[PDB]
Amino acid sequence: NMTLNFGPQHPAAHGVLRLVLELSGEMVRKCDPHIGLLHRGTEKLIEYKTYLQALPYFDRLDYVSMMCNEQAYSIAVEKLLNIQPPPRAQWIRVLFGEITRILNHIMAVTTHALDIGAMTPFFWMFEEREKMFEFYERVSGARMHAAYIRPGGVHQDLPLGLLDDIYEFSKNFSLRIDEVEEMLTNNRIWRNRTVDIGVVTAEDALNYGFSGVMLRGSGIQWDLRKTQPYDVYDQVEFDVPIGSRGDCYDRYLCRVEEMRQSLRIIEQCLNKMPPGEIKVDDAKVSPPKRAEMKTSMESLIHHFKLYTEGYQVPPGATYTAIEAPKGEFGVYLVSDGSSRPYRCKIKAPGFAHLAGLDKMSKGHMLADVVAIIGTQDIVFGEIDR
Amino acid sequence: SRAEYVVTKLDDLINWARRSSLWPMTFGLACCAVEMMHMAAPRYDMDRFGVVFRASPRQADVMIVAGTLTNKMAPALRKVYDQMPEPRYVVSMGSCANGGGYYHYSYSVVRGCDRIVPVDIYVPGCPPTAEALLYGILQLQRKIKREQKLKIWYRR
Amino acid sequence: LDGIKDRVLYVLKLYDKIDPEKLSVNSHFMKDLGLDSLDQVEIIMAMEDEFGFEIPDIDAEKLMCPQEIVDYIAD
Amino acid sequence: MNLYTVIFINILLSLTLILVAFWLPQMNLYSEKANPYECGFDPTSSARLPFSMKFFLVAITFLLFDLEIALLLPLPWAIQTIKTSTMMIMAFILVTILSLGLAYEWTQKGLE
Amino acid sequence: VRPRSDVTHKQLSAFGEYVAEILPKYVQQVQVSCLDELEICIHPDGVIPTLTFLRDHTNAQFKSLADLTAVDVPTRQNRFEIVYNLLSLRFNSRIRVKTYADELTPIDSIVSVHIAANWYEREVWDMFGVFFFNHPDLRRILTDYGFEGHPFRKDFPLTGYVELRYDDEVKRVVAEPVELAQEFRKFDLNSPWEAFPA
Amino acid sequence: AVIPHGKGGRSSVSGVVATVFGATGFLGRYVVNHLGRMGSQVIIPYRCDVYDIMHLRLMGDLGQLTFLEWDARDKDSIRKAVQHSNVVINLIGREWETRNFDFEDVFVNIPRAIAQASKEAGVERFIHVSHLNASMKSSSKSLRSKAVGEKEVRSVFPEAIIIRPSDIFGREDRFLNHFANYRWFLAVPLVSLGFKTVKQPVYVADVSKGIVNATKDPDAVGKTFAFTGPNRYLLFHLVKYIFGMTHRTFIPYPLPLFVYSWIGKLFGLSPFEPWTTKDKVERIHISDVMPTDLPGLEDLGVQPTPLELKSIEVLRRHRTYRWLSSEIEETKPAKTVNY
Amino acid sequence: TSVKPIFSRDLNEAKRRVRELYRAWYREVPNTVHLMQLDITVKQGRDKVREMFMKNAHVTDPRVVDLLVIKGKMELQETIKVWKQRTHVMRFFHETETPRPKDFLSKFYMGHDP
Amino acid sequence: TYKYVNKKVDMKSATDNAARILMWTELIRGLGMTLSYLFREPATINYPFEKGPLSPRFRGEHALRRYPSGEERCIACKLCEAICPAQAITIEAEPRADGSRRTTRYDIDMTKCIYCGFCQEACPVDAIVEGPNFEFSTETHEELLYNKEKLLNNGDKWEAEIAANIQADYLYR
Ligand SMILES: NC(=O)C1=CN([C@@H]2O[C@H](COP(=O)(O)OP(=O)(O)OC[C@H]3O[C@@H](n4cnc5c(N)ncnc54)[C@H](OP(=O)(O)O)[C@@H]3O)[C@@H](O)[C@H]2O)C=CC1
Ligand code: SF4
Ligand code: SF4
Ligand code: SF4
């Protein structure tokens, strides 16, 4: 049983993963993934920071999916305060929530192929990604790591003109997904390296807490967005892409299908986004508008206290989970009455998925392990936190 | 004919060859690779400028330390660094690797990679913009152009 | 039967943190030598390498006598 | 000779390049730069320890199939044999018999 | 104001009694928070039994383990508060079962009940130091290989006690006691005025 | 001055601003190491290219190390380097007098101008470094010159600590590596068959700590400490021992120093850093002076470290595929000849 | 008082486990110094194991001792395998750090707060 | 609403299958796609000559602004320090002889900074702004640490564009 460290710096291994492996022949006898090569303290650091200054940590937890993560903390802090965002902000979060799902899937499908050896899909879709980033930048200011979705709504209304461009792009992106397809969905070779690799049973997927496409790929029907609606994902209409004969190829097809379904959700959001405000009107939770803080005393006091001290969330604890592109992203945020949190365990769709690597890659070749790490969309930020 | 002239010209050639092709290593750690991967991508093609990823450290030069150098990975970085060919340059990318970044005061994060590997160009920004990395890679190219190794040999 | 004692005596003096010519078969590692509890452990282990037989975790506890060790090794 | 002339230039051109490669560059040498590369963390094992391959059978056949190829190499000059029929029968048998051997591998599932 | 649906508050409350009656033995407190969430609290010995009933009961199937965490209330005699959050894909519902464990009084492991916990339990040991009996392979997951101390404990310094740098003399990375060049500025933020509880 | 505040490690202050001119080389790497570890302000003058000076940057806190462009044939460069230093350490030396710098320059001429300016500046102490056993009438132009200088340095910066170290061994050492590097020559040419060559080797670190300590110690003024070592050796055991750890065969071959000085001349002829030199050869076969009375490493606080202890690290790179896994204690340590 | 047990009812049984671990480390020191090419002496290394083992010699609490070996065993595993590369092991020897004197006069001469 | 991504022997059917299997058709299909793009205009930009577009809110590099009169805007309320997530900004102040309130030392550690843009948000006088420039890569770590003089100098250099950018986005804020 030859032992070998897949290696932190592996061109294939996403980020840095030391996958100590015992390989009988080329077959992988045992898979003991090592983690923490990217532990950084995100959970302890948050205890020493106020709610609004811990929002930027969430973007960094799994930064492929920059915003969708922010929505989970937002929702969580809103629940604890029993405040809910204004109607326009909700649609925004679903608009950028979905755009972000595409961004993650373009990452997951194209990076999967680069490790497999197909390199042209990545360049094709990274150009589309690029175009999306620009939406982020023109809405938040940052290409990624925006900090746009804050605990009481979004930070600033969309620029005057973004919606139109999030249309032109959406109107075309489909063809770009279609192309990748003509390149990989039916390749006589993609199928082989992906089909019947890492099959996970339905009962086993629920047991190991997979909770993501990984469950959906095995045929279990669960989309937290339809089962437990958050924001206004209830008012839209989309089809969860369930899969059968769950294997690397089937789940892939599912991720390409949610890229397709997210364009259906984005279209609607553009078609039906309401006129209104983008942040709660409670100066108590949301910072006062700058014209107001510069002309009204109560607004300055509320601006000064909010930025310097904080929300002062009422004491309680909540586990709120959304459907981040990877899977169920949840924040268990225990909170004392103080302005700074007490605990914030981030449930990472990924801590559970990696664990499954062992029960998925059994009697498999070195190349199979590379394919399976891809079909779990492992971003070491969320796993290591 | 003055060898001094002969020397400078020769050095320049040497500098042009190195500066022109800077095969960067594929070192990606804390989600700045996403930006780097953007550089490699079509809007801002790294290749045009000579850059072409080559993971076998042995065959790679510039090491773009994109991301947070956690304590557990610290030794590894040093190793890979030590195993690259002789002329090796390091381009720290990201506030998380220039200094400590959002995670500077943490117990598991090295406050900077320049505490583990000598760093030549520091590219600033939490997700340092891909154009900014490209600016940083281009400044490494001006740093190499100025290097005058053979003239110091001659004058030594 | 004495050959065992011949080896056992050789092992005890070789570590050199014990028996500086005070080596005796009746001598007890813990009782008179003062060698530490742990050091004894090292000793039993030592004996195991030269004898070629590894004694259990417990019986090490009962023998603090080089002569008793030879008693057990012969068994 | 003409070939010998060409070939020695061919080796010379290579040997010239490798040499240039070792004597020209500036070389600083330390242990930590020459210890094996393991994708980072250093080798856990010998890196030369017994490797348990799982495709040997096929490998062996290759050897047997190579030989058959050999026995077939003289076919071009034998297509000329007055005894054309014989050559056909003989050749056909050679390929067929070896084909059977291969199929057996499959039948016995030896290669699989 | 959040869109509370009393329909839920009641149904989950009713289940909370259901469980309390079904396992009188280990359930100490049960409450459905105003946030519409149930948080059965169990004696540490009831870890195995309460989970198993929820994983395998027709009227309460809680198949997947969302998370296993341990808040640390230093004041509390039993420092850690292991919290297990579980989901029911069948009834589209959730429940949190939380127990209490002290530093040297280990909790049972549920890797048997849910194998998801194989990793999270290792995570709780590494960060907080709670120990889980019958765990297949408990060993540090997130911290460095030689790390001393459990980091997420409230009594552990953020910056920690050791940091790493490369030393030429020894040509190898080397720990040294932490010396920080700008200490974490500890802003005091609590206001001396409370908010009259609604 | 700079009141010393801190706990003692990096990011702390010790108050020693020190120019160290030859930091780029073997020992400098060590002198800057401790000075940086202690937290001292270190100004490292350099004329090597910036790429080579990078190894230095990693050692010391943000702002501890300042690098200045400097040319020996320009007095002004030395002037500004010592402008704001209070300790000057001189390690300028070479074995092959180069086309534009001969032994006098590297040992006596330059190291004088330097201390000369240092005084003008008002540096508290100067620590020149000259070789041990650098008799003013020794065989090697080098040793002769080095002595000549120590005479001069005493004039410019009277009582500038001077340290004469014995053969220095440490990773990248000449004394230890060079012998191991004679492998190319199948046999090993040694005058008197490697006998009649008693030498005492000193680990690079030992020498350094001493030097650093010399700066922070009052007694050092007007002293000529001679860092020597923990054990002497006839060159024979040393050579074999080395080959021993390297696990490479040894064939000590007698060859007249007369003819051999010629071999040194041959390598010396080479343009690129002659592998060996007339002088080096003489220096090799030059026995080390007795303990005399000069103070030592332990006097400056650093107890010498035996060669065998760290030899394993210095000679490891020279082993083969398997020999690379042998350790010093299963190996046999060579005998010590005090003579 | 009145405290539940972990793996040993009494210090006695617990000590049994410590003996086993000591043996384990004792038998392992040599291997590590060779598989990691560490520049230390086996005798020296075993001394370290002893020191580390002794550093906690004062404890008399059955429960505390049991955890201590659990933790100790875990360290062994890591070291047994190559999970802990040399940098990790040598750290035990505190080779680079400068030792601090404990003499009062010494501290007075150097640090504001001793 | 759910959907089945991959839910799913006549001679013709079989033959066509064989045609695909032995003529590698689905492989030739893939080659056509890449040949097609080879003919598309590539999307890359000459980086030095042409720059990727950044709109007014781009955070980029920190700068401290001054009033048109010439009085630096910062009045050292020090809540930019309070809301800095990374502890980057260090401010110490004392009353200037004028009697006004000004910062003796304002140090943004850019390596510590994660460019969140909250400081831009928090300032009441809006003295600290996220300036457009993103190209400030530096050879040495010390250069990245910025004191009041570098930021004020950065502010003076980019004030014209900073003013235009704030002009465009202030209604939104
Ligand atoms: N280990 C040994 O062999 C012994 C050494 N010594 C003394 O200790 C000192 C340090 O030894 P070591 O580090 O091994 O010597 P090196 O050969 O490594 O050189 C030491 C330093 O001197 C500098 N230097 C040499 N020549 C010149 C020049 N012409 N102009 C400017 N700078 C120069 C070098 O910089 P650069 O290379 O960039 O020019 C280098 O940084 C030497 O001066 C030597 O006399 C004493 C006894 C034994
Ligand atoms: S710098 Fe900002 S982006 Fe780069 S790694 Fe650290 S956090 Fe992620
Ligand atoms: S907030 Fe604006 S004004 Fe108050 S200190 Fe920071 S910069 Fe100066
Ligand atoms: S940007 Fe965010 S981090 Fe950088 S200074 Fe302004 S606030 Fe602190």
Q: What DSSP assignment string belongs to A179-236?
A: HHHHHHTT-TTHHHHHTTSS---HHHHHHTT--BHHHHHTT----HHHHS--TTTTTS
Residues F300 and A346: their CA atoms lie apart, in Å, by 55
Q: What is the CA radius of gyration of chain A?
A: 21
Q: Which residues are E82's β-sheet partners?
A: E70
Question: Where chain F is broken, by preceding residue (C–N > 2.5 Å)?
Answer: none
The sign of the dihedral angle between the CA atoms of H9, H12, H13, H14 is: positive
Chain H contact present for A62, CB below 8 A? no
Which three-class secondary structure state does DSSP give residue A156? Answer: coil
Closest partner residue to G16 (CB to CB) among C38, C42, C57 is C57
- CB neighbour list of residue G111: distance below 8 Å, 6 or more residues apart: F7, F8
- CB neighbour list of residue B2: distance below 8 Å, 6 or more residues apart: none
Q: What is the DSSP letter of B134?
A: H
CB E150 within 8 A of CB E101: no
CB F302 within 8 A of CB F181: no
Asked if E179 and F58 come within 8 Å (Cβ–Cβ), the reply is no
Residues E118 and E123: their CA atoms lie apart, in Å, by 9
Experimental method: cryo-EM
CA-to-CA dists, residue H73 to F33, H124, H126, H153, angstroms:
45, 10, 7, 13
The sign of the dihedral angle between the CA atoms of A318, A68, B105, H121 is: negative
Q: What is the DSSP letter of F296?
A: -
Q: What is the DSSP letter of C29?
A: I
Tokens of G65: 């001792």
- CB neighbour list of residue A306: distance below 8 Å, 6 or more residues apart: A52, A283, A286, A287, A288
Residues F207 and F209: their CA atoms lie apart, in Å, by 6
Q: Which of G99, G95, G98, G97 is nearest to G86 (CA)?
A: G95
Residues F208 and A76: their CA atoms lie apart, in Å, by 59
**Where in B1-156 does DSSP place strands (E)?**
63-66, 90-93, 121-123
Assess whether chains H and C touch, using the rule of 3 or more C-beta pairs within 8 angstroms.
Answer: no
Residues G25 and B82: their CA atoms lie apart, in Å, by 31
Instruction: Order across the sheet with B63-66: list the strands.
Output: B63-66, B90-93, B121-123
- CB neighbour list of residue F322: distance below 8 Å, 6 or more residues apart: none
Tokens of H90: 């260090």
Q: What is the DSSP letter of A327?
A: B
Q: For residue C60, which residues of chain G lie inside 8 Å, CB to CB?
A: 19
Q: Residue F93 C-alpha to ligand 1 middle, in angstroms? A: 4
Q: Half-sphere exposure of A96 toward its Cβ, with a 13 Å CA cutoff? A: 34
CB G37 within 8 A of CB G30: no
- Which atom of ligand 1 is the closest one to the Cα of F204? 1
Tokens of H43: 């999307």
Residues A169 and A381: their CA atoms lie apart, in Å, by 29
Report the phi/psi class of residue F169: left, alpha or beta, with left for phi > 0 and alpha for psi in -120 to 50: beta
Element (H, E) at A365: strand A364-365
Which three-class secondary structure state does DSSP give residue A329? Answer: strand
Which three-class secondary structure state does DSSP give residue B124? Answer: coil
Which three-class secondary structure state does DSSP give residue F34? Answer: helix
CA-to-CA dists, residue E39 to A35, A331, E10, E83, F36, angstroms:
30, 16, 14, 9, 56
Assess whether chains C and G touch, using the rule of 3 or more C-beta pairs within 8 angstroms.
Answer: yes
Q: Which of F98, F197, F112 is nearest to F146 (CA)?
A: F112
Which three-class secondary structure state does DSSP give residue F89? Answer: strand
Q: Label each residue of F59-77 as H, E or C.
A: CCCCCCEEEEECCCCCHHH
Q: Which of G32, G34, G41, G23 is nearest to G89 (CA)?
A: G32
Q: What is the DSSP letter of D35?
A: S
Q: Residue F22 C-alpha to ligand 1 middle, in angstroms? A: 6
- Mutation test residue for ligand 3: of H67, H79, H151, the one with most atoms within 8 Å of CB: H79
Q: For residue A2, which residues of chain D lie inside 8 Å, CB to CB?
A: 45, 49, 51-52
Q: Where are the domains of chain A?
A: 1-385
Chain G contact present for C38, CB below 8 A? yes
Instruction: Give the burial class of H73: count Cβ atoms within 10 A of its Cβ; 0-12 exposed, 13-18 middle, 19 or more buried.
Output: middle
Q: Tell me, using a 6 A CB cutoff, whether residue H86 lines ligand 4.
A: yes
Does A269 belong to an annotated binding site? yes
Nearest CA to ligand 3 atom 4: H77
| E162 CA: distance to closest CA in chain F (Å) | 12
- Rounded to 5, what percent of chain G is helix, strand, coil? 65, 0, 35
CA-to-CA dists, residue G3 to A165, E70, E105, F83, G18, angstroms:
67, 22, 9, 69, 21
- Which atom of ligand 4 is the closest one to the Cα of H120? 6
The beta-carbon contacts of A270-276 under 8 Å, at least 24 apart in sequence, are A270/A95, A270/A163, A270/A166, A270/A167, A270/A170, A272/A91, A272/A235, A273/A88, A273/A91, A273/A92, A273/A95, A273/A163, A274/A87, A274/A88, A274/A91, A275/A88, A276/A86, A276/A87, A276/A88
Q: Which of H83, H87, H92 to mutate to test the interface with E (most CBs of E within 10 A)?
A: H87
Place of tokens 């969860």: A240
- Max CA distance (Å), chain A: 75
Q: For residue A334, which residues of chain E lie inside 8 Å, CB to CB?
A: 71
Q: What is the DSSP letter of H135?
A: -
End-to-end CA distance of chain H: 39
Q: Which of G26, G27, G10, G33 is nearest to G90 (CA)?
A: G33
Domain of D101? 2-112
Does A31 belong to an annotated binding site? no
Annotated catalytic residues of C are: 36
What's the total number of domains in chain D? 1
Residues H156 and H64: their CA atoms lie apart, in Å, by 8
Which three-class secondary structure state does DSSP give residue H93? Answer: strand
CA-to-CA dists, residue F178 to E167, F169, F181, F331, angstroms:
25, 10, 5, 21
Q: Domains (ranges, CATH) in chain B?
A: 2-156 (3.40.50.12280)
CB A51 within 8 A of CB D79: no
Residue type, A172: N
Angle at E21 between CA E7 and CA E33, to 5 degrees: 40
CB A286 within 8 A of CB A53: no
Asked if E176 and F7 come within 8 Å (Cβ–Cβ), the reply is no
Tokens of G95: 């080779």
Residues E149 and E152: their CA atoms lie apart, in Å, by 9
Chain G contact present for F337, CB below 8 A? no
Which three-class secondary structure state does DSSP give residue A148? Answer: coil
Return residues 78-97 of G near D (CB < 8 Å): 81-82, 85
Q: Which residue of B has its CA nearest to A16?
A: B29
CATH, residue D65: 1.20.58.1610
Residues A194 and A245: their CA atoms lie apart, in Å, by 12
Q: Which of F76, F68, F116, F84 is nearest to F17 (CA)?
A: F84
| Beta strand pairing call for F252-253 and F188-189 | parallel
Which three-class secondary structure state does DSSP give residue E40? Answer: coil
Asked if D30 and F317 come within 8 Å (Cβ–Cβ), the reply is yes
Return the CATH fold of A1-385. Answer: Cytochrome-c3 Hydrogenase; chain B (1.10.645)
Q: Tell me, using a 6 A CB cutoff, whether residue H115 lines ligand 4.
A: yes
Angle at A185 between CA A182 and CA A188, to 5 degrees: 90
CB A199 within 8 A of CB A372: no
